[PDB]
Ligand binder design. Sequence first.
Ligand SMILES: *OP(=O)(O)OC[C@H]1O[C@@H](n2cnc3c(N)ncnc32)[C@H](O)[C@@H]1O
Length: 646
Amino acid sequence: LDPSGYNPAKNNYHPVEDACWKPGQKVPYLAVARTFEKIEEVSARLRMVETLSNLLRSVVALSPPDLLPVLYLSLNHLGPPQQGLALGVGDGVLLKAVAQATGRQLESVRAEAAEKGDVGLVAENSRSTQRLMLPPPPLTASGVFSKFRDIARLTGSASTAKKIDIIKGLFVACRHSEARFIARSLSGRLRLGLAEQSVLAALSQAVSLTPPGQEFPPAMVDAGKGKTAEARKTWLEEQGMILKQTFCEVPDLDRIIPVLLEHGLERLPEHCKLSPGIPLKPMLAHPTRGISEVLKRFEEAAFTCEYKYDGQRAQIHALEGGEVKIFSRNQADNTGKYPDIISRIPKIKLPSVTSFILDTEAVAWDREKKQIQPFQVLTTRKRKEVDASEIQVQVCLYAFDLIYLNGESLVREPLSRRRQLLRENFVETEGEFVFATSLDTKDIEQIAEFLEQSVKDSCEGLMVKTLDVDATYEIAKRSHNWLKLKKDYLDGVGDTLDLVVIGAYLGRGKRAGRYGGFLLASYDEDSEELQAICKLGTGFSDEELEEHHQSLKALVLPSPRPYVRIDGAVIPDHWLDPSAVWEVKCADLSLSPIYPAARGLVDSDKGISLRFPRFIRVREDKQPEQATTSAQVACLYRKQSQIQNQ
DNA sequence: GTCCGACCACGCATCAGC
DNA sequence: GTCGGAC
Ligand SMILES: *OP(=O)(O)OC[C@H]1O[C@@H](n2cnc3c(N)ncnc32)[C@H](O)[C@@H]1O
């Protein structure tokens, strides 16, 4: 029928009757755009999941081969994360394509996008570039997804202009609300309120209600008909856990969907299983606000405390044939990034180890003084085509978990077992491969000292993980089974800074209409200057951000004050009269390549910025001259234990 | 608690304009 | 990475 009247949120949805395309025919992108419209219209995740599940139900029964692109479009993903596909399209490039497609000037389009905080609204309500053009053939979901991959594949010189032509071709073919969601997808801000967890929930519910592998018309279109309310809830929850645990071990829709469409959800765990060479989703941590909050949530359950090393996570896979692969926490292939780790793998395990998967942290290590180097030194390593002899920043590994060992997966094993197998089958080599500094006890006085020792030993804090009660590696049960105890989480850390607001930035998405970010500055007394130190975008409540936008709008200046120095920082949208002083908390102080704050007091050509800055409260009693000085900022950077360790 | 999406610094890798 | 909001 007509995809313009598609309603996937209809009460009592028939996957075949309520669809807007014939069987065997490509799924129209308008059907996807209409589904995105009903999803964004609501705020309850349970209602959003059922709406997406209705689209997926119509897809599996009518056009199975279009299920993969529809899922990728709903996730705003280009493919499996280990393939490293990236659009390579910035906001300015997308805005240039919008202005050219709609026939408007670039400045008019850029002003509307900034004032509306969304490029999708600007790209949709502009049907002037059509001029005298008959409507192009309607967009399909698989065709739109194929164009996205085409844009991501374009590289080399003059590739930006070729990306614009493809984006322009999509816009002139967009009808109704299609332009809003393609521009949102290209900008990386789909803004649906639904993401990976809800897509997985909608997928398992769709294949459970409407099973795949059926002949059309489908004999079974709603497998929850003769079921009670509690019986259907527990059935769908049990089905959603089968898919989630499989995806947690194999986060690859290119591997899961074809197996899902041929054998069903119940046969999935026997075809897709955690194997070396295939990256898996890592165990995440929950921020804890103190020791006492660690004793809660865990309750009467024994746990271990380990050093939280400040580096990069390295998921190292050893295949049965001998090949070695390393993956980031985003399942990105980092094998070519660590040629040293590959050549060192012989010295970390004993001969009777054939295959494994370790969960380690690659930390920048120095062999000259035998000390841990900060995270900024680690990020100076090359990313690809690294020659082993050209490595200038050595790396020491800190293993803390074992997922695979000699052909068997230890995902369903307690940490006590996985840790015990780690120390038995692996040898420690200082400066290269060492076990995470651990400690198993309950004494609060002992734990508090371990937190101080970790910071003294160049670490962010402590990681708290149970040993036997809910101590498995099953992400699908709880993604954040571990706890992180960082010092800067406490109430009396001391690393608070009183900074002056010198600029504001127009907000986007949730922050559209008001300010999304602010420019902060410290006072340099000798130069009589306000030197920008960092930007601030988190820590405000929604009510506080409304008060800030109202009160700071009276201080808006057309030009910056002569004593304000920002150097290389992003020029604020609204220059502000220096008056507001805010207390700001951070985790560390970093040597900045753009920020001029305290430049010349610790480094000759580099200033200081803030690591993980967040807003705390307004300092009404303070004035811009009473704010933190650049001398205090330089003294704070020198007092950092990692800086003192050199 | 869960899930989602606002926002932060930094530096390698990449590309347009010249 | 931190953070707050809707459920
Ligand atoms: O703050 P965050 O979510 O990045 O912390 C989690 C990450 O911290 C790293 N890390 C460092 N030390 C450990 C130990 N001992 N155990 C687990 N993770 C650890 C990891 O990279 C982790 O993803």
